[PDB]
Amino acid sequence: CEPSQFQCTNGRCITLLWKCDGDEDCVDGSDEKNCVKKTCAESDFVCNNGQCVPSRWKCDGDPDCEDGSDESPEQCHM
Partner 1 sequence: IPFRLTPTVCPVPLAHTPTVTKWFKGITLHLTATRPTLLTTRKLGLRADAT
DSSP classification of residue 73:
T
Which residue's CB is nearer to Ca ion, number 3 or number 22? 22
23 is a contact residue toward partner 1 (CB under 8 A) = no
Nearest CA among 39, 33, 29 for reference residue 8: 29
Contact flag: residue 44 with Ca ion (CB under 5 A) = no
Residue 11 to residue 55: CA distance in whole angstroms: 35
**Is residue 43 at the binding interface for partner 1, with CB under 8 A as the rule?**
no
Residue 17 vs 39, nearer CB to Ca ion: 17
User: Contact between 16 and partner 1 (CB under 8 A)?
Assistant: yes
